Amino acid sequence: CPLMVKVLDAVRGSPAINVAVHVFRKAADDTWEPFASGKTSESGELHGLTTEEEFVEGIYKVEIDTKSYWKALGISPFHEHAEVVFTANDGPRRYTIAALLSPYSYSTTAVVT
Amino acid sequence: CPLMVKVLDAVRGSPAINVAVHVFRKAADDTWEPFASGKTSESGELHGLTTEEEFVEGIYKVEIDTKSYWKALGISPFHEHAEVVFTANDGPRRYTIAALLSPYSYSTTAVVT
Amino acid sequence: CPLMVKVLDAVRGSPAINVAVHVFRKAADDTWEPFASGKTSESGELHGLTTEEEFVEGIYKVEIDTKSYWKALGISPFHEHAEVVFTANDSGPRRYTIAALLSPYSYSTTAVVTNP
Amino acid sequence: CPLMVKVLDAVRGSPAINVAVHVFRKAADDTWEPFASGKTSESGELHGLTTEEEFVEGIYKVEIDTKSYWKALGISPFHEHAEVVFTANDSGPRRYTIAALLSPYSYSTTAVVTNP
Numbered sequence: 001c002p003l004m005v006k007v008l009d010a011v012r013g014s015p016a017i018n019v020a021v022h023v024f025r026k027a028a029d030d031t032w033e034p035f036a037s038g039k040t041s042e043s044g045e046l047h048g049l050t051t052e053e054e055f056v057e058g059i060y061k062v063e064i065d066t067k068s069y070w071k072a073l074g075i076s077p078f079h080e081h082a083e084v085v086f087t088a089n090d091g092p093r094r095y096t097i098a099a100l101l102s103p104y105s106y107s108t109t110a111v112v113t
Numbered sequence: 114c115p116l117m118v119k120v121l122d123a124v125r126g127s128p129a130i131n132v133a134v135h136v137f138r139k140a141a142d143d144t145w146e147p148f149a150s151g152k153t154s155e156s157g158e159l160h161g162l163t164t165e166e167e168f169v170e171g172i173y174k175v176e177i178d179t180k181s182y183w184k185a186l187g188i189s190p191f192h193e194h195a196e197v198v199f200t201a202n203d204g205p206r207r208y209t210i211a212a213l214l215s216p217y218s219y220s221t222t223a224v225v226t
Numbered sequence: 227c228p229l230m231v232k233v234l235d236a237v238r239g240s241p242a243i244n245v246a247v248h249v250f251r252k253a254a255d256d257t258w259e260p261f262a263s264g265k266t267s268e269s270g271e272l273h274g275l276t277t278e279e280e281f282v283e284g285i286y287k288v289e290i291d292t293k294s295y296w297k298a299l300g301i302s303p304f305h306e307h308a309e310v311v312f313t314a315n316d317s318g319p320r321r322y323t324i325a326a327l328l329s330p331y332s333y334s335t336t337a338v339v340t341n342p
Numbered sequence: 343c344p345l346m347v348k349v350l351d352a353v354r355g356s357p358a359i360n361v362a363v364h365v366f367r368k369a370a371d372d373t374w375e376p377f378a379s380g381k382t383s384e385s386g387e388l389h390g391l392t393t394e395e396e397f398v399e400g401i402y403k404v405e406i407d408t409k410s411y412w413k414a415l416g417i418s419p420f421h422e423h424a425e426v427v428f429t430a431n432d433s434g435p436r437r438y439t440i441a442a443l444l445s446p447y448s449y450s451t452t453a454v455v456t457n458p
């Protein structure tokens with residue numbers, strides 16, 4: 001699957017490989033509870049984060065560790081990370097969170113199908 | 114595959130389906146010669162444009178018919194089309210031209226692997 | 227003006243007007259503390275958030291309330307907000323412009339950093 | 343200033359300075375004819391391309407020479423240019439700002455259209 005993340009690199013023109021991604025769900029006390037995590041693959045994709053039964057309606061945060069990514073490439077970055085925060089609302093739906101990274105900018109879109 | 118195009122819609126949060134795409138190669142006389150064309154699929158992707166033997170080094174233009182796309186959705190658009198112009202340079206390489214559409218803006222990136 | 231925010235609307239081809247913006251700064255105990263807030267003008271710009279004296283070194287978060295913007299236009303948007311989190315002034319004072327481009331299911335930000 | 347161009351660099355977090363910009367207008371015979379050209383300033387802005395009298399209805403193309411920009415910085419870029427093609431002034435005169443954001447393998451443009 002219900003949740004996939006895809007990351008691209010606008011400087012090198014490539015998938016952003018080996019990027020750490022953590023997903024959190026907002027709790028009743030307004031704190032962020034860990035939900036799923038992983039590293040992007042050689043295609044820049046992170047699959048297998050969750051299952052249909054685990055992924056309920058609510059507010060989610062996808063934190064992408066952009067700073068570590070740029071540093072591993074020897075490139076100087078602006079942001080600490082990228083945080084993408086959205087509501088999941090329930091008919092049949094799959095969500096892709098896509099992000100395009102540059103050192104001083106990022107862009108994100110949602111593909112919901 | 115060597116050349117793929119992928120199109121997303123930033124307003125609806127979906128693949129951009131049924132978008133006409135024409136590819137041209139620049140000729141010796143500096144005119145644009147037709148090279149390949151097709152319509153994006155239900156995943157927003159256009160595969161099968163060319164073959165390894167046909168796709169040689171040179172300057173290519175990918176013209177995406179964004180105006181017709183928005184009009185078919187009932188949305189008022191700014192651009193006539195989106196034109197993405199690049200050089201192909203030869204080791205082993207596959208090119209993806211990705212575009213993210215909004216009515217008054219578009220973004221494009223290249224994924225070369 | 228060491229910190230400025232500029233917001234554009236990619237659907238209408240316009241400045242994004244009356245957008246609320248909240249800035250936080252990380253405290254010594256690693257929590258987010260309020261720092262400044264304001265709203266974009268008719269030009270989509272927000273000036274006056276802070277001063278050279280107040281805008282010290284630190285880790286800052288700029289949260290742009292994109293959800294309320296779209297809802298006010300009668301549109302149900304995907305994201306709760308657009309944001310940037312960054313370390314400021316580590317090599318001395320700088321001027322920062324955060325430029326954001328909005329659609330209902332997408333946003334982009336960029337930083338423009340200049341040395342005064 | 344009915345037509346303005348503003349360009350930012352997403353790698354350096356800076357205005358994109360000294361960027362050449364060429365504007366064309368479609369002629370009655372459907373070819374592109376030269377209309378105006380200029381280069382971005384130290385702020386990444388280009389003013390003065392045209393006038394209210396000269397900027398009539400038509401189909402315009404704004405070609406931003408991104409290739410030369412990156413090459414000047416010692417970088418080999420993907421695209422030949424960034425562009426916009428649009429019909430202008432169809433419902434009366436408007437003011438147009440073309441805002442571009444550049445990386446070596448990516449670009450974004452947006453239009454800001456206001457009614458004078």
Ligand SMILES: c1ccc2c(-c3cn[nH]c3)ccnc2c1
Pocket residue numbers: 008098099100107108109119120121211212213220221222
């Ligand atoms: C943000 C996120 C995604 C992109 C894409 C893209 C199309 N397919 N997969 C990604 C293209 C251009 N700009 C983007 C900005």
Ligand SMILES: c1ccc2c(-c3cn[nH]c3)ccnc2c1
Pocket residue numbers: 232233234325326327334336348349350441442443450451452
């Ligand atoms: C505000 C918001 C965005 C920008 C951009 C930009 C173009 N595409 N992505 C963003 C360029 C130049 N000035 C801007 C001011």
Ligand SMILES: [Ca+2]
Pocket residue numbers: 283315316317318
């Ligand atoms: Ca310091």
Ligand SMILES: [Ca+2]
Pocket residue numbers: 399431432433434
């Ligand atoms: Ca008219």
